[PDB]
Amino acid sequence: XXXXXXXXXXXXXXXXXXXXXXXXXXXXXXXXXXXXXXXXXXXXXXXXXXXXXXXXXXXXXXXXXXXXXXXXXXXXXXXXXXXXXXXXXXXXXXXXXXXXXXXXXXXXXXXXXXXXXXXXXXXXXXXXXXXXXXXXXXXXXXXXXXXXXXXXXXXXXXXXXXXXXXXXXXXXXXXXXXXXXXXXXXXXXXXXXXXXXXXXXXXXXXXXXXXXXXXXXXXXXXXXXXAAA
Amino acid sequence: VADHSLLSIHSAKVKITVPSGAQVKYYCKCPDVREGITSSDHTTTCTDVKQCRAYLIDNKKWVYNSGRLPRGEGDTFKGKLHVPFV
């Protein structure tokens, strides 16, 4: 139960500002015994290093964000911050916080551990949001393939990315394929999530997709029946 | 060349800086950053100014090859240069 958790994502217009928070918890050490990085990963790219801080002094910034991003840290609240100003279309990325024990003051190098956060999405564009419509993909009795049936749900017409899809509140994970999103000719995203199950449990066991789209605040639980479809 | 005006203190740690982005070659007797090709670094491990590498690889301008020069260990760079007073 060591943890780093980002917050502050969103859709921000060009030449505006945004602030990202990374909350630090768990460990065997005092707060302030870590160096902290911000890293960003753009859509379909590698990892870009953004900036660093440790005890509130050792700082530094990539020329991409230099004189535009200010990293700061509060050691009393266990909080790492990135204030970003004058945003551009080329800052659009998943931002990760990550912690280093190489550059900590107490220098306990033998017992080294990294740790990275879960990532927070910053999109720089003209703003908007749209929630998905969620539709069952129904299993057919004629589509019984060797005792296996497939069922799913289609998550359609949303913006921006991402949606998260779970099955039966996380109780069904085996055989689950959640597809990458496709950008439709409408300019909106769509994806399908599917799962393969025993055909014998159709109409006797309940299957529910759980779809979350954070930018619209849409949470949708969808029952999938054994409708041939 | 030495320049211990660089090695200030970061209120508990010994703090190196740089002239203009020049190449400062740095580590201390303790274990910390071992080369030093950087902007202004700090020093996690050591504290004393008197046990650190305040160096200036600032080879934007060559020199005369005085006997009272420390070698630039990397290479025999160019800079063949005349004598006026033949």
Curated annotation (Swiss-Prot), chain B:
Signal peptide: none annotated. It is found in: Virion membrane; Host cell membrane. It is a single-pass type I membrane protein. Palmitoylated via thioester bonds. These palmitoylations may induce disruption of the C-terminus transmembrane. This would result in the reorientation of E2 C-terminus from lumenal to cytoplasmic side. N-glycosylated. Processing of the precursor of protein E3/E2 into E2 and E3 results in a heterodimer of the spike glycoproteins E2 and E1. Spike at virion surface are constituted of three E2-E1 heterodimers. Interacts with 6K protein. Plays a role in viral attachment to target host cell, by binding to the cell receptor. Synthesized as a p62 precursor which is processed by furin at the cell membrane just before virion budding, giving rise to E2-E1 heterodimer. The p62-E1 heterodimer is stable, whereas E2-E1 is unstable and dissociate at low pH. p62 is processed at the last step, presumably to avoid E1 fusion activation before its final export to cell surface. This is Spike glycoprotein E2. The lineage of its organism: Viruses, Riboviria, Orthornavirae, Kitrinoviricota, Alsuviricetes. The chain holds residues 496 to 581 of 1242 of the full protein.
